[PDB]
């Protein structure tokens, strides 16, 4: 399990949607200039790029039922093992296993 | 252990209904492409008509008969160490081997235009020298020694 991997998820993909899923305009202002060979911004780039606990990077969704980083299916909310488990029990609509 | 499988006749040619030509393109087909064979078909016979080509009634069917395979073998066994035996091939196999013998003899060394490398081989297919004949006699000198104890 290692519950610290969910403690990352809570402050990444579950908190990024209102602040980091669109943010590239907030750095592009430092490339907004009136003329070439002229500066008005200097080192303020290191203040516009100051966050480290949150990023557009390092974002893993993980399986919402097993915390597993590989073998998740977004359309069902299940992993490779639970797709069979729900299908064999008939607990998932529209999906069948054989016989076409 | 019995193969003998199905039955497959294949299709004839679209321009004259030929059964031999529609099979010969399946020997010059490489990478699943028959177009490269259709650049060599008729052009080899028309390039033979720049050097020696007299009569065309059978096209190249008699060049494939002056080319004559005879030295085919099989292996016989009752355990470990095996015994070689020669085989009397059917006309359908004799023809299928003659079709490779001549196009492999035309490929023996690198040059331009396969229709022309094959026309040089078809002009030889009235006297048959070197390629498709000199290996045959050097293994035919065992053809009765490999019958002795059946």
């Amino acid at each position: 399990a290692k519950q610290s991997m969910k403690a990352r998820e809570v402050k990444r993909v579950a908190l990024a949607d209102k602040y980091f899923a669109k943010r590239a305009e907030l750095k592009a202002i430092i490339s907004d200039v009136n003329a070439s060979d002229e500066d008005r911004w200097n080192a303020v780039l290191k203040l516009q790029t100051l966050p480290r606990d949150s990023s557009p990077s390092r974002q893993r969704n993980r399986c919402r039922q097993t915390g597993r980083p590989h073998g998740f299916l977004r359309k069902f909310g299940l992993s490779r093992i639970k797709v069979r488990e729900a299908a064999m029990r008939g607990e998932i609509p529209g999906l069948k296993k054989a016989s076409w | 252990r019995r193969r003998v499988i199905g039955q497959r006749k294949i299709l004839p040619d679209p321009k004259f209904g030929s059964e031999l030509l529609a099979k010969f393109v399946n020997i010059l087909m490489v990478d699943g492409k028959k177009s490269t064979a259709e650049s060599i078909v008729y052009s080899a016979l028309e390039t033979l008509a720049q050097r020696s080509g007299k009569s065309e009634l059978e096209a190249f069917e008699v060049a494939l008969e002056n080319v004559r395979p005879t030295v085919e073998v099989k292996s016989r066994r009752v355990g470990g160490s095996t015994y070689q035996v020669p085989v009397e091939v059917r006309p359908v196999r004799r023809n299928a081997l003659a079709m490779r013998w001549i196009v492999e003899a035309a490929r023996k060394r690198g040059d331009k235009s396969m229709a022309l490398r094959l026309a040089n081989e078809l002009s030889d297919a009235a006297e048959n020298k070197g390629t498709a004949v000199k290996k045959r006699e050097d293994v035919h000198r065992m053809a009765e020694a490999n019958k002795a104890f059946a």
Partner: protein, 206 residues
């Protein structure tokens, strides 16, 4: 080989789902998360109510929730007000209004879910293991089954060794696509080992 439930591998053979509904392409997985939450809640509240399955339909912009029980009198209470407090919470975790449909199971000793519970009862007081499955076979064939299979695994005796026992009666037939076979696997939670229990029951083709 791979075992798996005879229900969902034969669901292409005129069989019904245990959950049947249609949802939006931006929340189908979240409605299936709800479909799990309603079962994981009800199997903790109705834990003594002899439940054989919970089936989900979603008509009328609500959730129906159909509960197959051999003890409905402790689900609905005395009468119909104890469930008004229950469906309030089912509707809370579903995000929609909730109906609740309560269905009585006539023959619980014919159902693989509750036959495994009836076997688990006698493993508490450790009766002879080879009798415990024969009573479950007898009781099910006397209830209109056309064949039954059983298996019990690990710490059945007697001594420290781990062994398995089975016995089989009548028809299965596991490759028969139309057989509509009833299946279950469970554990008896004993004070040494655990004892694993398996049951397969046949009644007739569809």
């Amino acid at each position: 080989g791979q075992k798996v439930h005879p229900n969902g591998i034969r669901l292409g053979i005129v069989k019904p789902w245990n959950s049947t509904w249609f949802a939006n392409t931006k929340e189908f997985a979240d409605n299936l998360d709800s479909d799990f939450k309603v079962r994981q809640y009800l199997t903790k509240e109705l834990a003594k109510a002899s439940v054989s399955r919970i089936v989900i339909e979603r008509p009328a912009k609500s959730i129906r929730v159909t509960i197959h029980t051999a003890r409905p009198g402790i689900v609905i209470g005395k009468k119909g007000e104890d469930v008004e407090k229950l469906r309030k919470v089912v509707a809370d975790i579903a995000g929609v209004p909730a109906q609740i449909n309560i269905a009585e199971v006539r023959k619980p000793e014919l159902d693989a879910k509750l036959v495994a519970d009836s076997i688990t009862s006698q493993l508490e007081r450790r009766v002879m293991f080879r009798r415990a499955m024969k009573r479950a076979v007898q009781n099910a064939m006397r209830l209109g089954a056309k064949g039954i299979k059983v298996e019990v695994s690990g710490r059945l005796g007697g001594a420290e060794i781990a062994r398995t026992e089975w016995y089989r009666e009548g028809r299965v037939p596991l490759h028969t696509l139309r057989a509509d076979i009833d299946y279950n696997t469970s554990e008896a939670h004993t004070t040494y080992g655990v004892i694993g229990v398996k049951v397969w029951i046949f009644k007739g083709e569809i």
